[PDB]
Each structure stands twice: as C-alpha cells, then as structure tokens.
Design a protein around this ligand. Structure first.
Ligand SMILES: *[C@H](O)c1ccccc1N
Length: 228
C-alpha cells in the first residue's frame, strides 16, 4: 500500500495473507469459513512452492494469539483466466479445514447483486504490499481509503484505454494506491466486499493509471459453484 497508514490490529478479521514458502505473496479475503478469495496471477508465480494462508494476523513475523497459518487443500483459479490478460483474475483457496472464527478471524459479506459501486464511494483496501518505490515490505498490515473512479474516465486513452470491462472497476490512485504484494486483497465498500485487487503488474500512485479491481458481484455464480 502506497500513501496509506498502518491498520488497526485485527480490525479487518477477513484479511488474509496468501503465502508461498513462508513468505507473504498476495493479499486475500476470507469469504466463507473454509474459503479465501485472491487473484489468479498470484499462484501463477507458484506451482513450485507450498501455498498457505495466514489468518488473524497483523504482524507477519510476530506471535499473536489469533494468528494461524492454514495449509491449502485445493487452489481453484477461474477457468477463463489467462497469463496475459487481466480478466477473470480470481482464485479460490480451500483451507485444510474450517477456520477457527473469533474477533480477529471472520468472513466478510460479499456483493452478490451485480450493480456498479457509485463513483466517489470511499472504499478500503488493505495489504502487506510494498510501501515505497524502493520496494520496502511492511511487517504489519497497512491500508488506505480510496474513492471509486467511474469506468468511462478509467477507460480513456490517457488512463487504461478501454481495458476496463463491466466485470472490472477502478479506484483513484493519486499518491494513494494498492501496490505489488497487495494484489488479491479486498476492496471493501460499506462493509461489503466489492472488489479483489487485480494482479497484473502496474505502476502505483500515478493518478493517470487507476487501480483495477475485479468486481466480485460479477462472479457470484462462479464463487457459489466452487464453494458448492
Ligand atoms: C498485484 O499482483 C500488483 C498490484 C500492483 C502493482 C503490481 C502488482 N503485481
């Protein structure tokens, strides 16, 4: 997260750190007791590593009573996702068992009605991604409030040039933005999950290249299908 602040410890109980060989790789969000939603390009960069999900965490390295590292029974990338596109960039991770719920660990309600979040709406994105251009990785969860950006502006040639489909949404990126390591994490609006930080490489904090998030509402049937 760029231009954000350290988050209040365990105030976002749905926040997950998807890890590869003990190292934070991507953000994720607990959407059911045994399922965490993240981005597909994340586990692309795996296949040759152990994928786990850390829940109830604030600090990645320090002990915390609510922290628990879960193994993953099955990784389910969206069937239509492709290495060179930013479409259908979702991945569902089935934990080895239902997560122990508590004040620090709880699934977040997610949007099932397919209607766009109104432009200007302030949404929250959190993550353990880089915090500056040098690539500094924070030990604890950071977050930033970002206003949703209308799709037409986001699609202008000067911005994302038509790449934003109805299944994608944008948030402003003027100095405040999600960045490398935050991909797969949640964009929460009004206490409901609306988007998943896309995981295509992108410049951070440049208002001319808005943040791109996959709209969960657009994939409600697929998520339901996988958790069936
Ligand atoms: C997610 O994978 C991401 C987000 C912002 C910038 C770069 C990357 N890789």
């Amino acid at each position: 997260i760029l231009g954000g602040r350290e988050a209040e410890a365990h105030a976002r109980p749905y926040m997950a750190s998807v890890q590869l060989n003990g190292a934070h790789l991507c953000g994720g969000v607990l959407v059911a007791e045994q399922w965490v939603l993240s981005a597909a390009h994340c586990l692309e960069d795996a296949a040759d590593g152990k994928v786990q999900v850390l829940l109830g965490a604030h600090s990645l390295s320090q002990p915390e009573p609510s922290k628990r590292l879960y193994d993953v029974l099955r990784a389910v990338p969206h069937p239509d996702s492709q290495p060179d596109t930013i479409d259908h960039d979702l991945l569902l991770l089935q934990l080895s068992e239902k997560a122990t719920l508590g004040p620090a660990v709880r699934p977040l309600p997610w949007q099932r009605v397919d209607r766009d979040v109104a432009p200007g709406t302030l949404c929250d994105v959190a993550g353990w991604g880089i915090v500056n251009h040098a690539g500094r990785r924070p030990d604890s969860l950071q977050h930033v409030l970002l206003p949703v950006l209308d799709r037409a502006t986001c699609n202008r040639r000067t911005h994302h040039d038509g790449a934003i489909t109805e299944r994608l949404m944008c948030a402003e990126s003027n100095r405040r933005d999600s960045c490398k390591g935050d991909s797969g994490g949640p964009l929460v609006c009004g206490g409901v999950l609306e988007g998943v930080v896309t995981s295509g490489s992108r410049v951070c904090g440049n208002r001319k290249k808005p943040g791109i998030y996959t709209r969960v509402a657009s994939y409600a049937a697929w998520i339901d299908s996988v958790l069936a």
